[PDB]
Write a protein that binds this DNA or RNA. Structure first.
Ligand SMILES: [Mn+2]
Ligand SMILES: [Zn+2]
Ligand SMILES: [Zn+2]
Lengths: 49, 1402
RNA sequence: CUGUGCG
């Protein structure tokens, strides 16, 4: 339990979410943010895969 | 009985000064035996002593014969009509100049200021009367707060006062004379006087009637269970009537698609449909004349030197032939232009049959030649000069006079590079053969379609700064047009060379008013014409790089979106188009539209918004350019907030919030003051006419009918039929229900919520002198102007009593944060905690908090509270009663405009409400001069009581919601806007039952409407973003709001001393770095400020601004530290040795041999010697002779700049922006620097005297830091110009030592230099020795211990004596200014990437 | 009883 269960990049997704180092993202957001760089644009660390 | 009389006669005989008129009054005083006459003659003696002291201190002749102004005018032979009869204290005649003196003594500050302002008013009336007869008068007023004088000693005068008081112990004087009123006035004039209840309380039955109005129907003594039962039943009834439909819902669930479709359909009748970015760039680059000028693809100097020289000597009036002098100047400039054009140079200051002469005015060649021929012909008619010797002689005469006028002030005319060979023997002939035959310059008011444009409309890509450069040049041209003198073609002209050409901004009207400018070019004639307001084009004057950089930052926030990369260039183009549109067309409507965009995007990322949000966002647009801005905003939101983005919503929300806060780039001033004043009066009056209490001409002695109307409206204000009525609640209607007011007061009572001028008598309306007469003014804001109710000093004191009472009440509680910074910080922390957990946050604003509130509402909520521990509260009640019966002076401009419109309508159209009001009043004879009404809480005059009411009401409403639902609601208010933080239960309720949650929010809205807490349509119920006090929080972080701070920095340029301006800009940039702004943009802001100062030809000093900072000097560095870093960058060798010696000194001082006791004395000797003395005392190698002669030109060395003795003893004594810059450039160009002989001179004279020396070098580092290295051989040798120079190493040592005392010892260490979406909320780690309790701390003790004389004049162990010693003698900075004038910044949210590129030091 | 200062 690290904060609320939302996609920090969407503010809309609450189901089927992946866990970052300190928050959550969505599957669509994970596939869309892995296209620019491996570093998380929120917590600045590599995204798990 | 006579013993005290005889003894005091002895004392006044022995201690009295020897005078001849005082001896006459004495012999007239000692002869009387009646004690009352002794009192009168003693006060007469004191008054005459005061009068003659004032007269000998002011050098005026004493008026003892009680001669009025008519007597003084008749004794000199000046016959005047019947004017005001005023007898002054003294008069002084110097030809046509009269100096008038009036003296008075007052014990109370309110009476003192009352007498001061009435004396000021009568003096101005006498001035206006004396100008009608053409006599110049100057006013002088002597208001003395004490009874001291310079003839009788202090203690004997006190004994005289005490014996006069002891003779008032008897009663024979009391029943013989001195009636109760006069006796009380005299006893108060002899006395030395927070409530002052010693007033003649004659409150009639009206007070008791109004008090009973606050009690009938209201219970205020209910049970903690009965109130909960009533609230539950009321919620049941409300929810029933809501589910049925009898009560309209106000909150709609946020559908982003529907919200965007509602925003795009705004102005559907005037905007066609969606527009692509390409069509927008096409229509934008050729939209308006100012925008057509930009993106146009448009491709020594003896005349300029002569023009500048003659512009310098045109103000000194070298000849009383204004027109003929201007003609001589035009002829000289023509000769200079011809001499320039024959050699090699082209036409530079020409436009075609029109040239730019002195006083930046266009003069036609034909008219110049005709007038010169007429002048020379008329001079030749009298008698030989062959039509050329006379002109040569007169030119030699005027040039000699001008050179002599520039020689005594030290201008050194050879500084202008005049090259005085243009005065040829064939000057007249050379002028008459001058034929340019160019294009005729015109203005062409009301121009035509863009197809009549000379150049190619639109070629500049919106990626280079050329458009911003042209905008900067044009804005500077307008601001310089603001300063034309216009003495006596007639059109004036400024010049702005952009590239390979020199455009000329022509304008016929003068002043800072809105006029019609015409951009002309010599090659194509008139280029553009536009009706512009010059005082609004400031924020782009030199920010060609600042604006490009803020655009680049805003774009880089969303650049790594991976779904805008196909539209990133279009988004950047749209952002720059919006910026250049709001900067090239600063209009209040564009500002309002961007604020409405802020509200829209705040309501876009939420769960529920107000149904009337789009009605508030849509504001009327005119001029077809504001529609272009709306289309740009719509396209930008369509690109950024498209349906298929769903990625990093935080970054896009921040970007659009900054696009909205771009409104601050438009100046917050009024376009026209009359229309905005009428609008403020409309905002003030419309609720009153809609409520039904608009009583005009209050008739200070209140009539029975006026009081009856007042109490009737007081009873009407308490009706507010709730949801239990037939029709239902009428939202947005002023008034508070008796039921909910009783519930609030009952729940507060039990432990459920918190758990000849002095006033002699006073009644229910006012203190027998005025029923709190206020004046209505408008306060400049970005979106819409605010109200201001300004009152006299007595009303100020009464409001201060009320506000102190209610501020104590609020401090006893722990919910409100308006003047409590600790509670604001707790609110920010709780908001971060509630947002980071995605709990529902209700950002509420309250529409019409001022006009709809009521002093009667506060009185009623006060009379029903118990306040278990009656005087004190009765005084508060009668003060609020006075506030109910309050007059507000309608502005004379508003009533004048309304009277003019009434005349125009009666002589010569859907009139408004206030217009109909004024007309109905004018048709019956009465003129509206004051509007006494009940429904007006002053905007600011009742801020503390309004905050307390908001606090208790929001506490009650949250208690009701929690008792009817089962969820706590934290609340934090600022008396206008608030935030409600919901717990986990309400958030889970919204997640599981949206209908019940929206019903709860509708109940909250209805309950707030049952008080005077109408929830504004700008309110937002969102579990992600939260707004409070213009602080936006996204996910526990904070929105940078970069554009707000950037615009606040580009705007705040005052006309004060340049170093104070630099301090202000440094504080603004410190706040900017603190919140969100990166370091490069702030370096560019500081460079922009330095360029603003350089344009004023100011000698930029190293102690102005550091424009090479690396986010290490803002987080944990004072302004002194930044200036020290700048000096270190200047001299990287000597500053190293100085830092070494200062490190050793700090080491030996903090925990070593006692050095502070004699360092205070060591800092008072000569700096050059003391440097080497200290370096040898510490053993470190002293600075070399070459690395010690570095100095900076301190213009304010002998006396500060006279922007029309240490400085720290002066900072504790506590127009427009473009006009401020104009005044700064004018003062820094005129005689601003003062000399040692108390003589003023220009800065040019100081540069000339510097060049009149073989020692100084003038070496600048990179941007004009301008530090000199005057050698030690001529250092203060024979009182040369070197007195203005101040050694740089000494000041650097002072600043470094003071900074080491302020923030740690790490500063002395040698500086070892070592995605735009990451931030680090760090703190200014510093073991300070200047604890924040230093408002009037021991600094004053040190000042009095070291500078006693300075402690007496202009005024009134701890490791602090050095802080006060390092600025009284080391006059470089204040070094203590962020504790008593400015305020420190903590919790720095700076970029983490820019922390790793910083410098470090041990 | 005033500034001439952007390439
Ligand atoms: Mn708010
Ligand atoms: Zn997502
Ligand atoms: Zn992450």
């Amino acid at each position: 339990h690290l904060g609320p269960q939302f996609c920090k990049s969407c503010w809309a997704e609450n189901k089927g979410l992946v866990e970052c180092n300190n928050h959550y993202l969505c599957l669509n957001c994970l596939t869309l943010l892995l296209g620019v760089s491996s570093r998380c644009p929120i917590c600045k660390m590599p995204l798990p895969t | 009985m006579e013993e005290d009389i005889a003894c005091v006669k002895d004392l006044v005989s022995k201690y009295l000064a020897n005078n001849e008129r005082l001896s006459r009054q004495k012999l007239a005083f000692l002869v009387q035996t009646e004690p009352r006459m002794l009192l009168m003659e003693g006060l007469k003696l004191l008054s005459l002593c005061i009068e003659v002291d004032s007269c000998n201190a002011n050098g005026c002749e004493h008026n003892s014969e009680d001669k009025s102004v008519e007597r003084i005018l008749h004794d000199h032979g000046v016959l005047t009509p019947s004017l005001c009869f005023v007898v002054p204290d003294g008069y002084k005649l110097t030809g046509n100049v009269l100096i008038l003196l009036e003296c008075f003594v007052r014990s109370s500050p309110a009476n003192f200021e009352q007498k001061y302002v009435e004396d000021f008013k009568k003096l101005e009336q006498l001035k206006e009367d004396l100008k009608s007869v053409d006599i110049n008068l100057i006013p002088l007023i002597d208001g003395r707060t004490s009874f001291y004088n310079e003839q009788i000693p202090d203690w004997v005068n006190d004994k005289l006062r005490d014996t006069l008081f002891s003779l008032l112990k008897y009663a024979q004087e009391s029943n013989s004379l001195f009636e109760e009123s006069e006796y009380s006035r005299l006893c108060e004039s002899l006395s030395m006087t927070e409530s002052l209840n010693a007033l003649l309380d004659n409150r009639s039955n009206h007070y008791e009637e109004v008090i009973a109005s606050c009690h009938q129907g209201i219970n205020n003594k209910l049970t903690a269970h009965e109130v909960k039962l009533q609230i539950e039943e009321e919620y049941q009834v409300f929810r029933n009537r809501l589910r049925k439909g009898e009560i309209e819902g106000q909150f709609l669930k946020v559908e982003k698609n529907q919200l965007l479709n509602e925003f795009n359909n705004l102005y559907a009748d005037k905007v066609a449909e969606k527009d692509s970015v390409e069509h927008l760039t096409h229509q934008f680059k050729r939209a308006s004349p100012i925008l057509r000028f930009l993106y146009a693809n448009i491709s020594e100097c003896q005349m300029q030197c002569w023009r500048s020289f003659l512009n310098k000597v045109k103000s000194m009036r070298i000849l009383n032939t204004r027109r003929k002098l201007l003609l001589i100047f035009d002829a000289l400039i023509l000769l200079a232009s011809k001499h320039d054009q024959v050699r090699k140079k082209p036409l530079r200051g020409w436009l075609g049959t029109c040239f730019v002469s002195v006083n930046d005015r266009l003069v036609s060649l034909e008219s110049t030649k005709k007038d010169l021929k007429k002048w020379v012909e008329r001079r030749q008619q009298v008698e030989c000069p062959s039509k050329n010797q006379i002109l040569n002689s007169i030119f030699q005469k005027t040039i000699s006079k001008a050179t002599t006028a520039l020689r005594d002030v030290g201008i050194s005319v050879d500084h202008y590079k005049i090259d005085m060979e243009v005065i040829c023997p064939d000057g007249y002939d050379l002028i008459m053969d001058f034929d340019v035959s160019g294009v005729t310059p015109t203005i062409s008011y009301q121009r035509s379609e863009e197809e009549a444009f000379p150049y190619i409309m639109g070629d500049v890509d919106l990626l280079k700064t050329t458009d911003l450069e042209r905008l900067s040049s044009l804005s500077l041209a307008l601001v310089n047009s603001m300063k034309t003198s216009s003495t006596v073609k007639e059109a004036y002209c400024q010049e702005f060379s952009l590239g390979e050409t020199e455009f000329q901004l022509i304008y016929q009207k003068t002043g800072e008013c809105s006029k019609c400018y015409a951009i002309n070019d010599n090659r194509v004639g008139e280029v553009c014409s536009f009706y512009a307001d010059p005082k609004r084009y400031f924020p782009a004057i030199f920010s060609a790089e600042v604006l490009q950089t803020t655009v680049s930052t805003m774009i880089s926030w969303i650049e790594d979106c991976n779904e805008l990369e196909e539209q990133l260039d279009k988004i950047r183009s749209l952002t720059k188009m919006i910026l250049i549109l709001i900067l090239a067309h600063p209009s209040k409507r564009s500002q309002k539209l961007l604020q409405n965009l802020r509200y829209f995007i705040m309501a876009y990322v939420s769960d529920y918004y107000h149904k009337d949000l789009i009605d508030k966002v849509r504001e009327e647009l005119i001029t077809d350019v504001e529609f272009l801005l709306y289309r740009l905003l719509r396209t930008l939101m369509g690109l950024v907030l498209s349906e298929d983005v769903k990625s990093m919503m935080t970054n896009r929300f921040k970007f659009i919030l900054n696009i909205s806060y771009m409104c601050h780039f438009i100046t917050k001033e009024t376009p026209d003051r009359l229309t905005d004043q009428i609008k403020c009066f409309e905002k003030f009056l419309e609720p009153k006419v809609k409520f039904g209490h608009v009583s005009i001409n209050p008739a200070d002695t209140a009539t029975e009918e006026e009081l009856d109307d007042m109490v009737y409206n007081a009873k009407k204000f308490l009706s507010k039929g709730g949801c239990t009525s037939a029709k239902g609640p009428s939202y947005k209607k002023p008034g508070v229900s008796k039921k909910y007011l009783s519930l609030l007061t009952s729940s507060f009572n039990n432990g459920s919520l918190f758990k000849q001028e002095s006033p002699q008598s006073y009644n229910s309306v006012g203190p027998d002198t005025g029923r709190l007469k206020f004046s209505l003014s408008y306060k400049e804001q970005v979106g819409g102007n605010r109200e201001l109710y300004i009152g006299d000093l007595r009303t100020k004191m009464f409001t201060r009593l009320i506000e102190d009472y209610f501020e104590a009440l609020s401090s006893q509680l722990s919910g409100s944060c308006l003047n409590n910074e600790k509670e604001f910080e707790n609110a920010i922390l709780s908001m971060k905690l509630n947002v980071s957990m995605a709990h529902v946050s209700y950002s509420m604003d309250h529409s019409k908090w001022g006009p709809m509130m009521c002093p009667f509402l506060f009185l009623t909520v006060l009379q029903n509270l118990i306040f278990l521990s009656i005087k004190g509260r009765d005084y508060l009640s009668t003060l609020l009663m006075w506030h109910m019966h309050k007059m507000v002076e309608i502005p004379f401009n508003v009533v004048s405009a309304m009277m003019k419109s009434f005349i125009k309508a009666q002589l010569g159209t859907k009139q408004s409400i206030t217009e109909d009001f004024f007309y109905s009043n004018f048709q019956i004879g009465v003129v509206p001069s004051h509007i006494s009404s009940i429904l007006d809480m002053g905007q600011g005059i009742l801020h503390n009581t309004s905050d307390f009411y908001a606090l208790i009401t929001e506490r009650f409403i949250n208690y009701a919601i929690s008792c009817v639902c089962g969820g706590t609601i934290d609340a934090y208010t600022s008396s206008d806007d608030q935030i409600s933080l919901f717990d986990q239960t309400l958030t889970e309720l919204l997640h599981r039952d949206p209908e019940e949650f929206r019903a709860l929010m509708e109940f909250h809205y209805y309950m707030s409407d049952q008080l005077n807490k109408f929830v504004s349509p700008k309110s937002v119920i969102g579990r992600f973003v939260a707004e409070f006090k213009s602080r936006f929080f996204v996910w526990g972080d904070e929105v940078p709001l970069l554009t707000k701070f950037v615009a606040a920095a580009l705007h705040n340029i005052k006309c004060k001393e340049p170093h104070q301006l630099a301090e202000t800009i440094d504080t603004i940039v410190d706040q900017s770095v603190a919140n969100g702004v990166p370091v490069h943009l702030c370096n560019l802001i500081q460079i922009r400020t330095l360029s603003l100062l350089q344009y004023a030809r100011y000698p930029i000093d190293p102690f102005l601004l550091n424009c090479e900072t690396d986010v290490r000097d803002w987080v944990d560095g004072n302004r002194s530290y930044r200036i020290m870093r700048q000096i270190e960058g200047l001299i990287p060798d000597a500053c190293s040795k100085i830092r070494s010696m200062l490190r050793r000194l700090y080491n030996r001082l903090k925990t070593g041999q006692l050095h502070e006791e004699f360092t205070t004395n060591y800092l008072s000797s000569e700096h050059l010697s003391s440097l080497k003395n200290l370096c040898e005392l510490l053993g470190v190698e002293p600075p070399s002779e070459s690395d010690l002669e570095y100095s900076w030109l301190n213009l304010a060395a002998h006396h500060p700049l006279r922007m029309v003795i240490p400085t720290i003893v002066k900072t504790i004594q506590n127009s427009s922006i473009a006009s401020g810059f104009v005044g700064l450039c004018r003062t820094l160009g005129s005689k601003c620097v003062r000399g040692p002989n108390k003589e003023n001179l220009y800065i040019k004279s100081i540069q000339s005297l510097i060049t009149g020396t073989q020692g100084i070098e003038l070496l600048t580092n990179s941007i004009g830091v301008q530090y000199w290295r005057v050698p030690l051989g001529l250092r203060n040798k024979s009182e040369s110009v070197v007195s203005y120079f101040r050694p740089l190493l000494w000041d650097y040592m002072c600043i470094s030592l003071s900074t080491a005392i302020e923030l740690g010892a790490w500063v002395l260490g040698d500086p070892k230099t070592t995605n735009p979406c990451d931030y680090f909320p760090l703190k200014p780690t510093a073991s300070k020795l200047l604890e924040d309790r230093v408002g009037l701390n021991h600094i004053i003790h040190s000042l009095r211990r070291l500078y006693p004389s300075v402690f007496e004049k202009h005024i009134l162990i701890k490791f602090l004596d050095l802080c006060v010693a390092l600025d009284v003698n080391c006059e470089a900075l204040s070094l203590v200014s962020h504790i008593v004038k400015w305020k420190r910044e903590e919790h720095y949210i700076v970029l983490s990437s820019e922390l790793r590129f910083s410098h470090t030091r041990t």
